[PDB]
Amino acid sequence: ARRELAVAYEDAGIDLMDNGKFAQGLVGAEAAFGRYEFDPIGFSKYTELVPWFREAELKHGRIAMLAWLGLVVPDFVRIPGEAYSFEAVPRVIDAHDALNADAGPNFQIILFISIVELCCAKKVFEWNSVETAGDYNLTRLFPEDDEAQKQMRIAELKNGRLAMIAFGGAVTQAVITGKPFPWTF
Amino acid sequence: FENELGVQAPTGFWDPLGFAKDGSMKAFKRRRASEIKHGRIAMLATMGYITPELTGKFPGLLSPSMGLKYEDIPNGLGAISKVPAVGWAQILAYTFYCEQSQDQSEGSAGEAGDFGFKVLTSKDEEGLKRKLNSELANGRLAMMAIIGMFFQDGLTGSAW
Amino acid sequence: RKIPAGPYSVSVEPLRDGATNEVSIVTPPISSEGVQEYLSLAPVFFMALAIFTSGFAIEVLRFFPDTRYW
Amino acid sequence: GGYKMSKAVPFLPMSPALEGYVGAEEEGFDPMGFSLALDIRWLREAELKHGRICMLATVGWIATDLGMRLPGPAYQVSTLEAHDAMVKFGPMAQILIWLGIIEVFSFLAITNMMEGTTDRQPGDYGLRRLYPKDEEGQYEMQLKELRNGRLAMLAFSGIVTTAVLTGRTWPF
Amino acid sequence: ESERGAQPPFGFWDPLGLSADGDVATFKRRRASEIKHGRIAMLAAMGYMTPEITGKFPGYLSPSTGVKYADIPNGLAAISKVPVVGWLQIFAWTAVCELWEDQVPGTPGHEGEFCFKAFKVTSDAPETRETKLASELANGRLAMMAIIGLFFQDGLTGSAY
Numbered sequence: 001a002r003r004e005l006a007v008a009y010e011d012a013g014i015d016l017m018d019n020g021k022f023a024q025g026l027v028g029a030e031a032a033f034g035r036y037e038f039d040p041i042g043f044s045k046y047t048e049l050v051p052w053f054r055e056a057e058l059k060h061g062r063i064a065m066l067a068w069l070g071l072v073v074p075d076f077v078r079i080p081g082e083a084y085s086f087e088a089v090p091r092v093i094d095a096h097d098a099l100n101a102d103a104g105p106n107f108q109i110i111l112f113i114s115i116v117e118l119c120c121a122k123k124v125f126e127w128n129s130v131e132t133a134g135d136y137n138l139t140r141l142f143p144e145d146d147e148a149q150k151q152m153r154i155a156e157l158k159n160g161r162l163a164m165i166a167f168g169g170a171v172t173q174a175v176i177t178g179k180p181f182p183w184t185f
Numbered sequence: 186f187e188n189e190l191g192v193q194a195p196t197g198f199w200d201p202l203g204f205a206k207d208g209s210m211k212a213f214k215r216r217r218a219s220e221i222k223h224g225r226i227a228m229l230a231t232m233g234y235i236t237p238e239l240t241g242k243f244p245g246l247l248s249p250s251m252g253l254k255y256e257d258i259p260n261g262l263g264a265i266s267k268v269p270a271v272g273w274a275q276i277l278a279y280t281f282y283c284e285q286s287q288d289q290s291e292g293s294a295g296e297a298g299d300f301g302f303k304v305l306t307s308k309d310e311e312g313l314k315r316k317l318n319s320e321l322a323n324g325r326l327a328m329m330a331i332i333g334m335f336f337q338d339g340l341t342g343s344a345w
Numbered sequence: 346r347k348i349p350a351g352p353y354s355v356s357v358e359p360l361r362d363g364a365t366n367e368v369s370i371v372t373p374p375i376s377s378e379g380v381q382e383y384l385s386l387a388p389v390f391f392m393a394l395a396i397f398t399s400g401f402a403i404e405v406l407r408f409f410p411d412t413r414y415w
Numbered sequence: 416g417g418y419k420m421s422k423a424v425p426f427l428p429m430s431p432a433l434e435g436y437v438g439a440e441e442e443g444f445d446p447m448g449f450s451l452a453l454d455i456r457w458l459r460e461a462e463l464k465h466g467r468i469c470m471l472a473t474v475g476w477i478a479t480d481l482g483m484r485l486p487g488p489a490y491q492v493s494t495l496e497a498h499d500a501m502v503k504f505g506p507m508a509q510i511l512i513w514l515g516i517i518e519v520f521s522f523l524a525i526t527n528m529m530e531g532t533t534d535r536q537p538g539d540y541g542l543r544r545l546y547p548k549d550e551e552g553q554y555e556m557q558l559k560e561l562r563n564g565r566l567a568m569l570a571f572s573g574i575v576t577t578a579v580l581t582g583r584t585w586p587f
Numbered sequence: 588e589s590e591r592g593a594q595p596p597f598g599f600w601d602p603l604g605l606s607a608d609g610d611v612a613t614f615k616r617r618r619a620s621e622i623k624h625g626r627i628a629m630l631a632a633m634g635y636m637t638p639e640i641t642g643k644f645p646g647y648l649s650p651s652t653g654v655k656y657a658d659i660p661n662g663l664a665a666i667s668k669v670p671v672v673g674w675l676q677i678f679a680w681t682a683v684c685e686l687w688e689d690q691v692p693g694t695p696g697h698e699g700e701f702c703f704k705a706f707k708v709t710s711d712a713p714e715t716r717e718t719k720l721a722s723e724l725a726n727g728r729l730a731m732m733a734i735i736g737l738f739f740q741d742g743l744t745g746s747a748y
């Protein structure tokens with residue numbers, strides 16, 4: 001029951017009531033043994049911004065997944081071009097402070113991210129509910145039924161959280177070590 | 186879930202995993218569209234890999250300014266970096282048009298390989314069942330072959 | 346207008362239901378007749394007259410420096 | 416069921432200010448919702464003025480960098496320094512004066528369409544000429560104008576940026 | 588539509604490639620296109636034969652720049668040497684000829700009916716009208732093939748003839 005976004009937006013806005021569930025019935029607790037309704041601090045008690053929290057978590061997990069993949073892969077293969085060669089930028093963490101500025105690439109990526117995020121800012125502020133959350137209508141290969149949708153949502157959430165933590169210890173493991181994909185000493 | 190093409194004498198339903206869970210009408214729609222299009226691309230790429238050797242490579246210029254006589258560039262890896270980027274752009278633009286002239290979303294004729302090309306039809310004698318099973322099986326073989334020659338090229342360094 | 350908002354407000358009433366796809370143009374609803382009336386004010390009209398006179402004197406002084414033709 | 420979505424941005428409902436306009440029934444691309452905060456008539460006027468200006472500017476750059484030059488010794492300057500040599504020469508101020516007259520009358524058009532003194536459509540100035548009589552033909556022609564204008568806006572932006580970066584003619 | 592047009596050789600309705608399956612709008616569009624093409628071809632072939640038969644290149648095309656009527660080669664070499672705004676003004680006169688009145692479907696311009704009126708077939712005789720327009724169409728087609736062949740001859744040989 002994905003509730004196609006056109007009819008899903010009918011219940012958008014900042015919901016003022018409380019569903020009585022965990023964080024507004026969001027998929028994601030869904031642990032191995034039972035449900036890990038984590039929320040120790042209590043941000044989910046702030047029920048009206050629970051969809052905001054889900055949107056933030058999904059965006060962070062997606063950016064993470066991409067970033068972990070994008071500091072794992074370049075340590076093996078680089079983009080054709082002298083500025084990206086293994087000799088011009090010896091390490092992947094150097095790639096940030098290697099192009100920047102007037103070299104072009106990183107500034108272009110920042111510019112396009114800014115454009116695509118400004119264009120999708122109307123999705124976060126307004127047109128954001130419990131069900132929509134991170135739904136940017138890129139479903140396509142989103143399986144039908146209902147439990148399959150829950151399984152794919154929890155897969156996305158677990159992979160995103162795992163990638164956030166992994167990227168954290170990865171940029172950390174590379175600054176203190178300066179090594180390829182296995183960032184052990 | 187068997188009758189809509191893809192079934193032939195060597196094996197009717199070959200899927201240990203992937204579609205293992207069965208059902209999933211939309212999932213099979215997208216998977217069948219992917220299989221058909223992948224088979225078409227693999228057929229074209231295999232033919233473009235055999236033509237430079239079975240047939241004389243194009244004696245023209247490809248890039249008249251840069252003199253790309255079609256023989257200096259190889260067949261396989263490297264030719265991606267050898268064909269000019271301003272020509273790869275037009276190749277990808279033809280791909281872009283052929284994948285955006287008609288729809289390809291769920292419920293559309295696009296997720297069937299139906300893009301209004303026809304030509305190699307039959308007389309509508311329901312032997313188009315045979316022709317479309319040929320589509321699927323021939324594309325499966327062509328894709329096994331296309332990645333096989335991909336590897337062959339990469340591991341041997343050059344075309345073979 | 347139960348929510349206290351100032352006079353001449355382009356703000357929609359903040360007491361709305363679930364997110365509304367509505368058009369709320371934030372630009373002043375000015376009027377061409379009103380703008381012409383405002384530019385005809387005694388302060389505006391007479392300051393414009395003073396600016397025109399001063400600039401005319403400036404140009405006369407520039408193209409005819411000093412009183413050479415006295 | 417409701418909330419007609421943007422065919423361009425499929426996760427944002429189409430702005431109701433876009434209804435009845437040329438580019439809404441097929442694209443409806445207003446993700447930032449400018450039409451929700453700004454008058455859509457003014458936005459369409461700005462878009463069409465920009466598109467026409469850029470469509471003239473693109474071919475002007477093409478001509479100037481292809482050797483198409485007026486018969487004058489002062490006119491033998493490259494496109495990069497064209498809008499310094501012509502500024503000092505005078506014709507830039509002359510074009511400014513005439514375009515200022517045209518834009519004053521465009522201002523009159525805008526400040527008469529908003530008060531209802533005319534049934535003028537945003538981009539309309541009365542030039543029918545190559546204008547279909549059938550309404551569908553009119554809509555398709557307006558869509559062609561808009562798409563060409565947007566394409567030439569982007570094209571001229573790229574042309575000027577690349578020419579300033581790498582001084583070349585146009586194919587680069 | 589087999590009874591429309593000219594068909595001077597008679598019994599020569601030629602869809603060949605089955606171009607017109609039957610649609611009045613598309614046929615009228617192509618008829619306007621063909622009549623305009625024929626007029627252009629006849630005018631161009633005249634402006635191509637005239638510089639050779641009667642040379643008659645008196646004076647400078649550009650008194651300021653120095654472009655002389657007698658220095659522009661006849662044929663395709665003309666579009667590098669006819670002055671810049673000279674070509675601009677030729678284009679502008681074509682624009683005047685095509686934009687003075689309406690050529691949109693539903694108007695006389697879509698049928699080729701223009702404001703020239705330099706033959707004035709005298710409506711009391713609406714039979715020489717068909718002859719005049721049929722001759723115009725056939726001559727336009729003949730000069731069409733002629734002018735494209737002349738351009739190809741210019742390209743291949745290196746000069747006009």
Ligand code: CLA
Nearest residue numbers: 190191197198199200203204216217219220223325328329
């Ligand atoms: C892009 C690849 C692709 C895709 C999407 C499909 C899709 C499909 N095939 Mg199929 N097939 C393919 C390639 C593919 N095929 C090839 C190459 C062969 C030749 C062996 C076959 C042979 C075949 C038979 C004999 C049958 C199907 C059937 C089906 C349908 C049901 C099974 C299913 O949903 O699987 C979903 C798709 C997949 C599980 C493929 C995903 C790829 C997996 C996950 C990894 C594969 C890795 C590969 C082996 C190694 C590549 C090298 C790598 C190491 C770099 C479905 C439409 C059945 C059918 O028609 O039903 C009526 C059927 O009976 N296929």
Ligand SMILES: CC(=O)O[C@H]1CC(C)(C)C(=C=C/C(C)=C/C=C/C(C)=C/C=C/C=C(C)/C=C/C=C(C)/C=C/[C@@]23O[C@]2(C)C[C@@H](O)CC3(C)C)[C@](C)(O)C1
Nearest residue numbers: 141142143203212262332334335336337338339340341342
């Ligand atoms: C000198 C030297 O030797 O170096 C050589 C090395 C070598 C290897 C020989 C070379 C070669 C040959 C090549 C290029 C061989 C081809 C490699 C390919 C095609 C890689 C793409 C894989 C894409 C996949 C698996 C997509 C998979 C997508 C999947 C599985 C989708 C999976 C889904 O989960 C998703 C996403 C949603 C689910 O709901 C449904 C399912 C379908 C399960 C080189 C590169 O030339 C150079």
Ligand code: KC1
Nearest residue numbers: 247248249250251253268269271272273275276277278279
């Ligand atoms: C009728 C329209 C048309 C024209 C008129 C045209 C003309 C030129 N094409 Mg082109 N083309 C298509 C259409 C047209 N091409 C299509 C549908 C495809 C299939 C996708 C295609 C493929 C390629 C490729 C692969 C290359 C290519 C190029 C050139 C080139 C060289 C100029 C130069 O080198 O100076 C010129 C003049 C080569 C390149 O270098 O482009 C700069 C290059 O490699 N084209």
Ligand code: KC1
Nearest residue numbers: 486648649650651652669670672673674676677678679680
């Ligand atoms: C009554 C209005 C009128 C005037 C007053 C006028 C005047 C000049 N015309 Mg023009 N003209 C038309 C109208 C007028 N022309 C018309 C209806 C056409 C038919 C398309 C036409 C055609 C051409 C061509 C083909 C050329 C041309 C040019 C010049 C020129 C030289 C300037 C200079 O030498 O500085 C001057 C003074 C020649 C050129 O030299 O431009 C640099 C050039 O090649 N004209």
Ligand SMILES: CC1=C(C#C/C(C)=C/C=C/C(C)=C/C=C/C=C(C)/C=C/C=C(C)/C=C/[C@@]23O[C@]2(C)C[C@@H](O)CC3(C)C)C(C)(C)C[C@H](O)C1
Nearest residue numbers: 101102103104105107108111442561562565566567569580
């Ligand atoms: C979709 C649509 C249309 C469309 C479209 C199209 C074609 C849209 C395309 C838009 C497009 C093409 C937008 C450009 C982006 C390029 C950017 C931002 C460049 C970045 C470049 C940057 C930031 C520069 C980087 C560097 O300079 C630095 C920083 C210093 C130098 O040392 C190094 C370099 C040079 C690298 C129609 C058909 C027109 C209308 C229709 O209705 C709707």
